């Protein structure tokens, strides 16, 4: 019975990521789907079907610092994990030839769907669902 | 003090590590008791 | 703080225009006269780290120089005057290879030609693979000193160039010294490159003016 | 019949709570935390004391009083800020 109930055309904790890595991806999805208008309204103390929009690297670090469990700061490990995600292709850039990260015109976007990030937040105890 | 600060900022191993009591503090501790010892 | 990021018709013609030759005048005089002694005093104090740098290099740890200010002159003094003579006069004249990253005309293939001639006894990565298998049986003796100024250089930032330099540090018989200026430089390296580079980090900020690197980009465009 | 009285032993406990609540409402859209809001802590402490028929406002009565009053201000906050004040006032 169990053979027919699943297609089994699938090739087969889905993504082993560090604590720094998990919050890095969580912060990016907010950037790719929340308008820049709402950055100050929600995070400062003062669309699920659409394709993600681009964002700047400064937006990512600010939100990552804003939700990380006093400040976390940006050491080498944070950037080391961020670059790996690009190498792991969970985050895309606006280029295809002669990749140069430090060129200012390159932008970033999220390559991870909603369903994967849903399960990531569960292991983090971060309630993303209340931000939309 | 300035040399200790620059050594710490540069990460040099010349700067001493504060796991033991400092020489000045232990010298003061020894002397304040030696003066009242005899 | 991060909250400082969320909380955020004049033209340059209104400013007095300065010719290119006039620009070099004021810069040269103040770079020498202003903050002369304290920077030299800091430089002389920083020379005391040569034994630690020399010790770290022998163990197989690459040295990365970062901070505010130019670092070309500091690397020149360390490798030529202290590093190269001491190794020869203690292991018993070691060649030193200097690569400029601030020059946008640099080519990786031209650089690799020097590496092959100086190290390989007579598709760049395939040749590098051969070198690793060769130096495994070779004695762990430093043979060539490599200095890479501006590892964040415009022609050096590219992924292909970064991969070539990263594979070199696997061979223990090569000494690597590098300097960077971009703030997001660590973003250029993931685990696969950081492991290969095997860096030991030193903040060497000196506020030394970058006269040499300023030559390759015109200030008149500003 | 019951009119419990007060002794100023827990003054530091209440005063610092009052200062703490005011500090977190200086730049957040929230309740108008004022002197009238502090009086609720003391009066609601009187009710707890007057439930035991005791004549004295004990330390425990203020402990129930402070928890009820502070939790109200924490609960009526936006989601992004609520989780932060959750841990900032864990002493109370």
| DSSP, residue by residue, A86-116 | HHTTSEEES-SSS--TT-TT--EEE-S-HHH
DSSP code at position D28: S
Data resolution in angstroms: 3.4
What residues pair up with C199 in beta bridges, in sequence order?
C62
Contact by Cβ (8 Å): C99, C149:
yes
- d(CA A42, nearest CA chain D) in Å: 6
Mutate to test the interface with C, among B1, B6, B11, B15 (most CBs of C within 10 A): B11
Q: Is C144 helix (H, G, I), strand (E, B) or coil?
A: strand
Q: How many CB atoms lie within 10 A of CB D65?
A: 24
Question: Å from A82 to nearest chain C CA?
Answer: 7
What does chain B come to in residues? 38
8 Å CB contact between C141 and C177: no
Which chain A residue is nearest to residue D82, measuring alpha carbons? A45
Kindly list the strands in the beta sheet with C144-149, ordered across the sheet, starting from the edge strand earlier in the chain: C96-100, C144-149, C174-179, C62-66, C199-203
Alpha-helical runs (H) found in chain A = 19-33, 38-43, 57-67, 76-87, 114-124
Question: Is A83's CB within 8 Å of C3's CB?
Answer: no
Counting Cβ atoms within 10 Å, is residue C96 exposed (0-12), middle (13-18) or buried (19+)? middle
What is the nearest CA distance from C203 to chain B, expressed in angstroms?
6
Measured between beta carbons, which residues in chain C are less than 8 angstroms from residue B6? Answer: 42, 45
Contact C201 A76 (CB under 8 A): yes
C53/chain B closest Cα distance in angstroms: 10
Per DSSP bridges, beta strands C96-100 and C144-149 are parallel
Distance CA A40, CA A24 (A): 19
Candidates A83, A97, A105, A106: best to mutate against C (most CBs of C within 10 A) is: A83
Q: Cα(first)–Cα(last) distance of chain B, in Å?
A: 35
Quote the DSSP letter at residue A55.
Answer: B
Contact status of A45 with chain C (Cβ, < 8 Å): yes
The C-alpha of D70 sits at a distance from chain A's nearest C-alpha, in angstroms, of 19
Query: Looking at chain A, which residue has its C-alpha nearest residue C155?
Result: A100
Q: How was this structure determined?
A: cryo-EM
Q: Which residue among C6, C187, C189 places its CB closest to the CB of A40?
A: C6
Residue in A with minimal Cα distance to C158: A100
Rg (CA), chain D: 14
SS3 breakdown of chain B: % helix, strand, coil, rounded to 5? 55, 0, 45
For chain C, which chains pass the contact test of at least 3 CB pairs under 8 Å?
A, B
CA distance linking residue C207 with residue C36, whole number of Å: 11
Assigned token pair, B7: 């050594």
Residue A60's CB: how many other CB atoms inside 10 A? 20
Instruction: Specify the long-range contacts of residues C74-82, CB closer than 8 Å, at least 24 apart.
Output: C74/C43, C74/C46, C74/C204, C74/C206, C74/C208, C75/C147, C75/C149, C75/C177, C75/C179, C77/C47, C78/C50, C78/C53, C78/C177, C79/C145, C79/C147, C79/C177, C82/C50, C82/C54
Q: Do chains D and B touch (3 or more CB pairs under 8 A)?
A: no
- For A23-45, b/e burial (b = at least 16 CB within 10 A) is bbbbbbbbbbbbeeeebeebbbe
CB contact (8 A) between residue D80 and residue A42: yes
């Amino acid at each position: 019975i169990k053979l027919f109930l699943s297609t089994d055309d699938n090739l087969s904790q889905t993504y082993d990521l560090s604590i720094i890595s998990k919050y890095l991806l969580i912060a990016s999805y907010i950037c790719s789907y929340l308008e820049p208008r709402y950055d100050a309204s929600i995070f400062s103390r003062k669309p699920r079907y659409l394709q993600p929009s681009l964002f700047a690297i400064e937006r990512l670090l600010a939100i990552f610092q804003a939700i990380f469990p006093s400040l976390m700061k940006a050491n080498i490990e944070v950037f080391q994990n961020l670059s790996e995600l690009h190498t792991l292709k969970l985050i895309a850039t606006t280029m295809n030839k002669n990749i140069d990260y430090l060129s200012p015109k390159v932008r970033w976007k999220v390559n991870v769907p909603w369903e994967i990030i849903k399960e990531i937040s569960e292991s983090v105890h971060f309630n993303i669902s209340d931000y939309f | 003090r300035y040399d200790e600060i620059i050594f710490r900022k540069l990460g040099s191993m010349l700067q001493t590590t504060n796991i033991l009591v400092t020489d000045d503090q232990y010298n003061i501790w020894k002397k304040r008791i030696e003066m009242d010892l005899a | 703080t991060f909250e400082g990021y969320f909380d955020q018709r004049h033209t340059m013609s209104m400013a007095p225009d300065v010719t290119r030759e006039e620009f070099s005048l004021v810069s040269n005089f103040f770079n020498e006269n202003f903050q002369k002694r304290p920077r030299q005093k800091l430089f002389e104090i920083q020379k005391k780290m040569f034994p630690q740098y020399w010790f770290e290099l022998t163990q197989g740890f690459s040295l990365l120089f970062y901070g505010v200010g130019s670092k070309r002159n500091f690397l020149e003094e360390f490798a030529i005057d202290y590093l190269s003579p001491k190794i020869a006069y203690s292991q018993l004249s070691i060649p030193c290879l200097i690569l400029n990253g601030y020059n946008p005309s640099c080519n990786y293939r031209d650089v690799f030609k020097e590496i092959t001639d100086l190290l390989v006894p007579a598709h760049v990565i395939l040749q590098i693979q051969k070198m690793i298998d060769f130096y495994k049986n070779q004695p762990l003796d430093i043979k060539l000193i490599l200095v890479v100024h501006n590892l964040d250089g415009p022609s050096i930032r590219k992924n292909t160039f970064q991969t070539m330099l990263s594979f070199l540090s696997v061979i223990r018989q090569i000494a690597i010294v590098a300097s960077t200026d971009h703030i997001y430089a660590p973003l250029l390296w993931d685990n696969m490159k950081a492991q290969n580079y095997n860096f030991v980090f030193h903040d060497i900020s000196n506020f030394e003016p970058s006269t040499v690197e300023s030559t390759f980009q015109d200030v008149m465009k500003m | 019949k019951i009119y419990p009285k007060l002794h100023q032993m827990d003054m530091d406990k209440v005063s610092r709570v009052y200062a703490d609540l005011r500090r977190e409402s200086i730049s957040t859209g929230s309740f108008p935390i004022t002197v009238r809001h502090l009086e609720s802590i003391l009066r609601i402490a009187e009710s707890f004391a007057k439930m035991r028929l005791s004549e004295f406002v004990s330390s425990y009565d203020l402990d129930r009083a402070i928890k009820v009053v502070v939790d109200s201000f924490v609960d009526a906050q936006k989601v992004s800020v609520r989780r932060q004040l959750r841990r900032s006032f864990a002493i109370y």
